[PDB]
Amino acid sequence: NRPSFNEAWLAFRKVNHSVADVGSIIGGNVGKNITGGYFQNACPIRMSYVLNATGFPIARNSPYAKVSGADNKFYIYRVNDMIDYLTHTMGKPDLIVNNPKQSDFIGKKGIIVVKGHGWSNARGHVTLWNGSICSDQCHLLGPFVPEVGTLWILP
Amino acid sequence: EALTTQYSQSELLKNWALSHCLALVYKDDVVKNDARATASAYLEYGKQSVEIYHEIDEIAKKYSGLKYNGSISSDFNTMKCIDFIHDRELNELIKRRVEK
Secondary structure: OOOOHHHHHHHHHHHOOOHHHHHHHHOHHHHHHHHOOOOOOOHHHHHHHHHHHOOOOOOOOOOOOEEEOOOOOEEEOOHHHHHHHHHHHOOOOOEEEEOOOHHHHOOOOEEEEEEEEOOOOOOEEEEEEOOOOEOOOOOOOOOOEEEEEEEEEOO | OOOHHHOOHHHHHHHHHHHHHHHHHOOOHHHHHHHHHHHHHHHHOOOOOHHHHHHHHHHHHHHHOOOOOOOOOOOOHHHHHHHHHOOHHHHHHHHOOOOO
16 A cells, blocks of 8 residues: 555655765665765655655565665665656556646645656656645745656555 | 756766766865766666666776876876776776666
8 A cells, every 4th residue: 555644754854854864864875875975866765765664665676776774675766766666566646737836736645756857867856745845845836847746645 | 957868878877987086086075066966967867776886986996096297286186087987997897787
């Protein structure tokens, strides 16, 4: 099934910090790659932490690039991989919206994926959504232009 | 708005090598962070496992550790990166990558 919304939001707050701090928190190969500067975008790593912390851990054999943490659990480090992973483990989203905006996602909570143009380091972002804001950053719904917004509701 | 999505896997790996080396040789925090961010962009669109970037770093470390001199005052760090991206082993490493 799916992680509870409350647990997800709690977990995410634990890693809602600078990528360096995320490195200190998770440790192991995650921390090591962050220390070395190889990982700068904490987004998929934060989401990985969420899944691993709420009873829906990423399998060692999921066909996505993973790195272990000190907990010996696994952390995806590419946004595109994280998005595909959700698409393939959670199934099909509860809501899909072209040219998404905040009002489109009102009154619903869970995992949100926004793809669009204008970023030089990624095709989009994946984070938590509580009905009015994102868990990290934040008022995504300005250089980034969202083309597609996708939500998996968390119970 | 950058050309990040237009590079081939091979080009991404070369762009990564360059940016990463620049992150290694420069002292200033803002610049170093900038080069790191840039590198991370190229890693995002890669299909390769993280170890290949570690290996690229090994090779880069062979250049960033060099002492360069001239008849003008400089450490010539920039050119260490430029010589590095011409490295034959770097190129062979990228060409024989398992994850194409």
